């Protein structure tokens, strides 16, 4: 199947199969995944920007480690997007976390590489 940039999964598709059976990701790879943050799941380090949360949908759930400056929109019970790398089973090392605030990403060849 095609569409969008990169690939993507969900908290069903990382466990059950990508939207039919297209493949499963590598425990060695980078990927992206939307899901709804479970309430209460978001632990954050009392002294650090580390997070641990779970994201689910009407199907299954996955865990997320993130560490860093979290979207100020990110909330307990909204439909976020993760991206980063597969940890082990159904857990993602997020590398950014996004709060479905549309997002766009300006490339290099505009800012200071015109």
Swiss-Prot record:
Q: Cite the binding residues for heme.
A: 101, 105
Sorted keywords for this record are: Cell inner membrane, Cell membrane, Cytochrome c-type biogenesis, Heme, Iron, Membrane, Metal-binding, Signal-anchor, Transmembrane, Transmembrane helix
Q: What is one process in the GO biological process aspect for this record?
A: cytochrome c biosynthetic process
For this UniProt entry, the molecular function terms from Gene Ontology, in alphabetical order, are: heme binding; metal ion binding
Q: Where in the cell is it found?
A: Cell inner membrane
User: Is Transferase included in the keywords of this UniProt record?
Assistant: no
Q: Where is the composition biased (Basic and acidic residues)?
A: 103-114
Q: How does it assemble?
A: Forms a ternary complex with CcmC and CcmD. Interacts with CcmF. Shuttles between CcmC and CcmF for heme delivery.
> Can you say what this protein is called?
Cytochrome c-type biogenesis protein CcmE
Species, as recorded: Escherichia coli (strain K12)
């Amino acid at each position: 199947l095609r569409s969008n940039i990169d690939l993507f999964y969900t908290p069903g598709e990382i466990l059950y199969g990508k939207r039919e059976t297209q493949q499963m990701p590598e425990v060695g790879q980078r990927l992206r995944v939307g899901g709804m943050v479970m309430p209460g799941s978001v632990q954050r380090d009392p002294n650090s920007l580390k997070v641990t949360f779970t994201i689910y949908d009407a199907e299954g759930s996955v865990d997320v480690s993130y560490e860093g400056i979290l979207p100020d929109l990110f909330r307990e019970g909204q439909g976020v997007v993760v991206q980063g790398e597969l940890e082990k089973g159904n857990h993602i090392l997020a590398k950014e976390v996004l709060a479905k605030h549309d997002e766009n990403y300006t490339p290099p060849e505009v800012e200071k590489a015109m």
